[PDB]
Ligand binder design. Sequence first.
Ligand code: QEI
Ligand code: ZN
Ligand code: ZN
Lengths: 380, 383
Amino acid sequence: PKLSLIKVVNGCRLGKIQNLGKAGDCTVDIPGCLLYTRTGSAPHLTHQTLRNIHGVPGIAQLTLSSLAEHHEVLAEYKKGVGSFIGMPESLFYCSLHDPVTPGPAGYVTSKSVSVWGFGGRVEMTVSKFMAIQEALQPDWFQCLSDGEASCAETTSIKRARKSVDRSLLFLDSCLRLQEESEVLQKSVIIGVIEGGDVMEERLRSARETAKRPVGGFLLDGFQGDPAVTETRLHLLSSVTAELPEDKPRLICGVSRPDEVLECIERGVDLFESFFPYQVTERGCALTFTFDCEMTSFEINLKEKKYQEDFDPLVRGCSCYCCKNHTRAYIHHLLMTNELLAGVLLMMHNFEHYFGFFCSIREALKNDTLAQLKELICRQM
Amino acid sequence: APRIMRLVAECSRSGARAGELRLPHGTVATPVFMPVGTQATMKGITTEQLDSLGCRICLGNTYHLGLRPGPELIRKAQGLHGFMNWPHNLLTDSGGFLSEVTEEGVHFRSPYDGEETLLSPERSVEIQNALGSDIIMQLDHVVSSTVTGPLVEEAMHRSVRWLDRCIAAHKHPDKQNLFAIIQGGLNADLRTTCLKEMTKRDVPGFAIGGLSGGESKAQFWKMVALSTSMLPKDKPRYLMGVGYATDLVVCVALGCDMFDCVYPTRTARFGSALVPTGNLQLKKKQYAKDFSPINPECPCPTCQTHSRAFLHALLHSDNTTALHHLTVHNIAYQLQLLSAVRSSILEQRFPDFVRNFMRTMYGDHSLCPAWAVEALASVGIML
Ligand SMILES: Nc1nc2[nH]cc(CN[C@H]3C=C[C@H](O)[C@@H]3O)c2c(=O)[nH]1
Ligand SMILES: [Zn+2]
Ligand SMILES: [Zn+2]
């Protein structure tokens, strides 16, 4: 992955990642987001409705938690997950867990890590993990890692120390297995930075993982409720300061527009796009401006004030829902528990979110991210 | 009165008809299956998808819209056309079919006591006027085909009187087309009376009601044949509540032009995909590694893009898109079947088409349903 930075202003990396994909003729602009999927599908959106959205990222995120239970099927299919799900044109980064429904913690050992899907728990060693990636054949895939040192419970320093060594042992094992596979050599392994909330282990994880020939870095354990805490924000900057500038930085569990801008200032490139999915799942539509439970970035369309509101969700929006339907129609679909609401809302919430990331790159070119950041936070 | 239907081709053997309907929101080729649009949106199918499938007319449930969001909001939303943003044609029912029927109309009681709502023939025409559909249905007195006795005749004569009351209340025949509903149950005499009485009214179309309600299939197709034998040849015949593939092929042979059924939209929720050999139960594990499409000859987005194995994976997940994929295909199967029926009529090969459809569906002709063999034989189609 040949990464090229246009400029770095206030710590924000503006650029593009070239020479990507099976043909090597793909580019990913940074900072950006990945298309969020569940079981190889964007939620509520078929391949047909997905084409109705403007600015869909060229790289999509898959989760082992939603696909590991389909290992035998994709193995017999042989042709990779992208062609299996009818999306062979997109790039695919396979992460370990799903950000919204990850499953219960406490199943990480030095010998195996577990994920959870619709059928149940799937326990996978490093061998089984690489066998599943050999069947999925993703462009990028997160390496097997120990991210459970970062939890709400009072974590021990030895536990944070273990997550660094355990993830490194997983990393060196996956590199030996990848070098012994013709198919997996085409994929790009992503190192995972761990260490919990211990600064020393966070710094050691960043330095030791960077010493491996990984193609990128996953910043794990910085997810925060309701957002990234100031302690982990400072923790994040200390980690990115130890990472090479020539490789992409990915973060998981960080998708709300306010934390996105905070992490871009810390040098994070790629983000998950599960926040517009959460907004859709509660019958809400993003309405926050970027020109020049429920948050204030959105409106609740189950509210009775939208019974006769015949305006679009966002005036001027070019999405399918806002150019063809009204809030009254969306409110009606939600009251009658119709699945078109989830479709029409997801189309707008994805288009609004993808357009929000366009404003980040547009503002970085104009050196006006501070104004855009001020406009985002003023709506809270 | 201006005819809304022109016959393009007829089967010299049977009663099959190929034609097109001239309606305010475009022309519709016949025979035509009409999907229940209120369920398609509930299935997550947008207007653009349903239009892409070639559907030029769909149904709307008047009673459903009477509960949410009501006729007042639909009128303010530029009719039902503008409310759901449907550019093509719409057919709404009278909304009368928990309910008591008197001469005044159909009575709906409020839950846990409360005032009643009276849906009279005049009220029904007024409600359907606000929806702005291109075809409106008469308010009829509906009794189930399983019932016998004096209520059948009582409901038939009341359906005729209500037809006259709907015609008087319908003050815009230039914008909406009112259809009569043949009742009379499974009684040949009462139905003949309803056929003789209702065909004297100047309505642009006629519908065959009171059927497909658990009765024997022998009593079913014979009541269809009695209806088509006495209905105007130059006006469309609408058979309500029929959507099974064999039933459509047989009833086209008997002279029906329009059909509706919630069948294609519902079995998609059960994991079943319609195919020329019947249906595929894609949720069953035999399709877990079937890397072929549902039907390679189907033009729908699902079959042009996805495999049975992938749809099987989605059915074993929380993806609501699994229902979206099957609803799209099942509607496409209905439209493809009816357009193939229509091409056979235009090309004067409808019997050969029926023989091939029955052979592919059931195999040897001795395995075909006995009622369908008799019904097709009554119009000169032998297997
Ligand atoms: N208004 C109206 N709508 C209708 N939809 C379907 C039918 C015909 N099938 C119904 C009639 C009696 C049977 O029990 C069956 O349930 C119909 C009708 O006879 N009238
Ligand atoms: Zn929009
Ligand atoms: Zn299909």
